[PDB]
A and B are shown apart, each in its own frame.
With several copies, the nearest count.
Chain A
Amino acid sequence: THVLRFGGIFEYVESGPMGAEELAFRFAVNTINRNRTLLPNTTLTYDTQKINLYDSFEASKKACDQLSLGVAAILGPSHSSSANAVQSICNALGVPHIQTRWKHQVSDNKDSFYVSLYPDFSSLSRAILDLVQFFKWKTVTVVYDDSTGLIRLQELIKAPSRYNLRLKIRQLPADTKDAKPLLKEMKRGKEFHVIFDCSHEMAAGILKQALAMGMMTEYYHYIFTTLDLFALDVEPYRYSGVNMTGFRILNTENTQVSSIIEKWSMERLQAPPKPDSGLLDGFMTTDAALMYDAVHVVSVAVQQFPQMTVSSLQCNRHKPWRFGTRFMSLIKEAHWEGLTGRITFNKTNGLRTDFDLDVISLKEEGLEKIGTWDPASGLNMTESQKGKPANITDSLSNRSLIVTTILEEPYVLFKKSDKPLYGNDRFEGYCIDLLRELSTILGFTYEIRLVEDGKYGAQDDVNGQWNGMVREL
């Protein structure tokens, strides 16, 4: 039971309860403490430091504080403009640095002591490209929120010069709630293959908006580039048949994972969830899964270098460490089966560019796997199901639809009598009888209404437009 301490930085609320990340970090320490299968002869302690959000000098302070106490590795904070400072200190002082949020690596930064458990969006962009080309789209329409979304999808946006695609680009405004003006624009342009790029909270925030303008139908087909997609409240949508597709790096097939996530739910609702925003109560976000898997890879490294000790380096004592060079290589050569599955590191840049993805989609039941992906192979898909036609095709009674008509002498007539009557109960004729049989054989929930323009509808020579039913259709 040798003493060993890990640096924990966690940009946090600066109020209220603990963030998800820090809890998931402590969870790992406790679990490693109990199951002696890992580090039986060494007990790792842990120190945590809490900083303001986005204050690089402030982070550097606490990094110097922890390095004074001595650590093995610093689990970097989760927003870039502080990650850079912490990394630049860890590199220059020899202590390995492990990161969990994707940052924009500077073009030629010669750092060598950093690894990143978040999947590279080079690979993620490539996989999204493969998925798009699988659905055989041609008019896709990217949507992002932060400026960095470009850099994040650069592998996608260059693609039009190779494959046959035409893709617009739009940006969610600075305010999150008013997405209506963008949605209005998008609906007018007839954009029916949308790629969102926003942290899943923002995704839920715009999905309500999309509901209010009635996009949530069988036409539109969103692809969500984020990873924590299961946290969505699927329920108000899963019966409208839109075609949502996301990804899930979070391997949840192993029974071990099921148990760990469950006990996480036990200790996590311990902190209050959000009842209104539209997220599941008590589900473990990827940004906490990466915390958890960080400690395991660190331990798998540490258990094979017993000579390791904890020296008290000082920031003013710029002399590097006696164990950094070997320890860092040991980490970079690790393998493990964490909550995200396979764990490896590109030997060249210490990034992560090889993993295993479960593509998912919205079936009628809910989010359920429909294939796998990984950078080595292509995109393997197992949705080879076959459905013989139920006699009442398309419905028992679902997906209410409006129908549109016009008065014609034998076909459609307003019901003739004294008392005024409303709804699809004031009309009679032939076509109504045709529609009537349709409902009795397919289960329709139809509202009938007339065309204000009152024409058959035809091509308009002036502008290429139409009128009557054709225009509205």
Chain B
Amino acid sequence: CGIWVRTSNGGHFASPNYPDSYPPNKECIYILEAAPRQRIELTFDERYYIEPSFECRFDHLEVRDGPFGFSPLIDRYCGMKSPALIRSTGRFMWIKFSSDEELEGLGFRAKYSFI
């Protein structure tokens, strides 16, 4: 799953097998690293725009500012809605995508940018 996107002013970040449904049982990490004094602007492109009536687990895309499982939780995104664009100067937006044992969806498309 690893697409090492280190040292880019901007670049493509996306779920595996993006135009297809993402594979099951996948717990793969992604890490965004910014040089000192920079700002991270994460652009996220949803594939499908619908309004869910519920929020659930089993497939969750959370965002962290710092090392994983050890930095404060920013938010934990799921469903088919496009999350709002996240602007922080924590300089380390490290993002993990999970997978349950079934029930794949349309995946996601994102774009990281550095200033």
Give A contacts to B, CB under 8 Å: 180-181, 184-185, 188, 213
Q: Mark B51-63, 1 if CB is under 8 A from A, else 0.
A: 0000010100000
B101: shortest Cβ distance to chain A, in Å?
A: 9
The SS class assigned to the B binding surface is loop
Residues from chain A with a CB closer than 8 A to the CB of B56 are 181, 185
Closest residue of chain B to A180, judged by CB?
A: B103
- B102 adjacent to chain A (CB < 8 Å): yes
Query: In the complex, which residues 60-115 of chain B have their Cβ closer than 8 Å to any Cβ of chain A?
Result: 100, 102-103
A467: shortest Cβ distance to chain B, in Å?
A: 15
The SS class assigned to the A binding surface is helix
Closest residue of chain B to A185, judged by CB?
A: B56
Closest residue of chain A to B102, judged by CB?
A: A213
A-B interface contact total, Cβ < 8 Å: 11
Residues from chain B with a CB closer than 8 A to the CB of A188 are 58
Residues from chain B with a CB closer than 8 A to the CB of A213 are 102
Residues from chain A with a CB closer than 8 A to the CB of B100 are 184
Residue among A184, A185, A188, A213 facing the most chain B CB atoms (10 A cut-off): A184
Additional 9 contacts, C-beta under 8 A, given A185-B56, A188-B58: A180-B102, A180-B103, A181-B56, A181-B103, A184-B58, A184-B100, A184-B102, A184-B103, A213-B102
- Interface size of B by CB at 8 A reads 5
Jot down 11 A-B pairs with beta carbons below 8 A, ordered by A. Answer: A180-B102, A180-B103, A181-B56, A181-B103, A184-B58, A184-B100, A184-B102, A184-B103, A185-B56, A188-B58, A213-B102
A171: shortest Cβ distance to chain B, in Å?
A: 12
B98: shortest Cβ distance to chain A, in Å?
A: 14
Residues from chain B with a CB closer than 8 A to the CB of A184 are 58, 100, 102-103
The 3 closest A-B pairs by CB, nearest first: A184-B103, A180-B103, A184-B58
Residues from chain B with a CB closer than 8 A to the CB of A181 are 56, 103
Residues from chain A with a CB closer than 8 A to the CB of B58 are 184, 188
B87: shortest Cβ distance to chain A, in Å?
A: 31
Residues from chain A with a CB closer than 8 A to the CB of B103 are 180-181, 184
B42: shortest Cβ distance to chain A, in Å?
A: 29
B79: shortest Cβ distance to chain A, in Å?
A: 12
Closest residue of chain A to B57, judged by CB?
A: A188
B8: shortest Cβ distance to chain A, in Å?
A: 32
Residues from chain B with a CB closer than 8 A to the CB of A185 are 56
B93: shortest Cβ distance to chain A, in Å?
A: 24
B13: shortest Cβ distance to chain A, in Å?
A: 26
A178: shortest Cβ distance to chain B, in Å?
A: 10
B1: shortest Cβ distance to chain A, in Å?
A: 16
Closest residue of chain A to B58, judged by CB?
A: A184
Residues from chain A with a CB closer than 8 A to the CB of B102 are 180, 184, 213
Closest residue of chain A to B25, judged by CB?
A: A452
Q: Mark B21-37, 1 if CB is under 8 A from A, else 0.
A: 00000000000000000
A210: shortest Cβ distance to chain B, in Å?
A: 14
Closest residue of chain A to B100, judged by CB?
A: A184
Closest residue of chain B to A212, judged by CB?
A: B102
B50: shortest Cβ distance to chain A, in Å?
A: 14
Residues from chain B with a CB closer than 8 A to the CB of A180 are 102-103
Closest residue of chain A to B27, judged by CB?
A: A452
B77: shortest Cβ distance to chain A, in Å?
A: 18
A161: shortest Cβ distance to chain B, in Å?
A: 11
Q: In the bound complex, how far is the Cα of B103 from the Cα of A95, in angstroms?
A: 47
B9: shortest Cβ distance to chain A, in Å?
A: 37
